Amino acid sequence: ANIKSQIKRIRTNERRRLRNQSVKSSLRTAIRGFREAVDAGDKDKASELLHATSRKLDKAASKGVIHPNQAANKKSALALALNKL
Amino acid sequence: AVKIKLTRLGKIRNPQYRIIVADARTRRDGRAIEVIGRYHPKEEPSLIQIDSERAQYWLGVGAQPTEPVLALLKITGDWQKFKGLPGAEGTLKVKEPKPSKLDLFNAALAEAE
Amino acid sequence: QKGPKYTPAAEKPRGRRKTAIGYVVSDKMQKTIVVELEDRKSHPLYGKIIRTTKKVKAHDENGEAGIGDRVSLMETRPLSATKRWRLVEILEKA
């Protein structure tokens, strides 16, 4: 609040938080939908939504919102869940 | 970035510098990765020594010289060599070695006798 | 003129993990044994050789080492809190 650059950064940090929050929410909804599909037991729906969720995880790592290793962990867990169930 | 810097040694009004490889963020008089040379500007010609084998390695891996260190690397020919440009022999000047003390003692002996 | 599209990594020698020998004092946890290691150090001031004992928790998958047995161990990454050793070989059963 004292330094000009910091005052500007207040505005810019907020803009980025909103962008990241929105993306993370979308990812979380997608993973939730897949989980519900697997707990319902519907191999077909579950497989279709695994592929869309997986690509969404990858794209979130491209925007820098999540780390690539975190995307790999999420993708791996989902795919293993579909193979087991 | 890893850089080639001058670190200040010596006392007041007598700046003596070691040529060191150090991370940009490290404070001037901080821990260095290597000492590859020294530079004494108060002399005439200013004293310059560089370990050319290490300077070539560090420039090879991408160490970025500071402005004065780049001037020194050109005097020594280590810059021209690293790039491939000519002038690798360099134009390093060395202080004329003063007369030996024993010879001046013999001179005084002969002169007076 | 063109360089290679793949650059292979330089060879690094794989490090030396520590090893030890001890005796099993406990096997009451699942897949874990407690092993006592013995060390001999010279006392800093008095110079007498002093014998000291350190308990260690080691991982064994199959429960092949029971209480009282002599076993060899090797360091490993953390497998849980405490556990940092794996059982290599049950060396002399008793």
Binding site: - | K101, L104, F105, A108, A112, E113 | -
Partner: protein, 200 residues
């Protein structure tokens, strides 16, 4: 600082010639003051102390600087007493006195301090400057015709010149072939007592 008080009273207390040309000493070889005649109780500490006082009040070195000389001598690889004596002998005011260009070590100090000598072509006015092997000591042009220095030219003979020194010219040019060994040094003092004093 310097000691600038009476010079005879110091030799009288110590019972030995320091300047060595002093008539008032030979007239009254006893210590000074009212009680200078009286009997003094013997002690080893007084003997050791007075040998140190003879050294430092001969060469004109303050106790602080003299103690640094001791530590260097003891640090040096030779035997401490020899090293200490030849260090004090290396002093430029002493070298000037041994060369003969001065009458007293006090006069030698003043001359060196006032800027009348050069060593290897560079002016030196530091009396404690320690000469080294193959030093050449010369006189600046202005001081060559200087009236007391003229006296010094034609007063050669007061004392003998030691072998490590050599005056080679009428310019009064001094050469130092080496540092003096204990045999070369000739001083009215038992150096072993000073080494013992500082081991207390």
């Amino acid at each position: 600082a310097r000691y600038t008080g009476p010079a005879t009273r110091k030799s009288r207390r110590l019972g030995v010639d320091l300047v060595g040309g002093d008539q008032s000493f030979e007239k009254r070889p006893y210590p000074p003051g009212q009680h200078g005649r009286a009997r003094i109780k013997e002690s080893e500490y007084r003997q050791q102390l007075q040998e140190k006082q003879k050294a430092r009040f001969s060469y004109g070195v303050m106790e602080k600087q003299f103690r640094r000389y001791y530590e260097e001598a003891n640090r040096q690889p030779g035997k401490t007493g020899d090293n200490l004596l030849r260090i004090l002998e290396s002093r430029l005011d002493n070298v000037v006195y041994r060369a003969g260009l001065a009458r007293t070590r006090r006069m030698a100090r003043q001359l060196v301090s006032h800027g009348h000598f050069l060593v290897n072509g560079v002016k030196v006015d530091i009396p404690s400057y320690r000469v080294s092997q193959y030093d050449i000591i010369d006189v600046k042009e202005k001081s060559l015709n200087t009236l007391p220095f003229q006296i010094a030219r034609e007063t050669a003979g007061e004392r003998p010149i030691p072998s490590w020194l050599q005056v080679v010219g009428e310019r009064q040019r001094i050469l130092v072939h080496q540092l003096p060994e204990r045999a070369q040094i000739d001083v009215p003092l038992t150096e072993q007592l000073i080494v013992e004093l500082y081991s207390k």
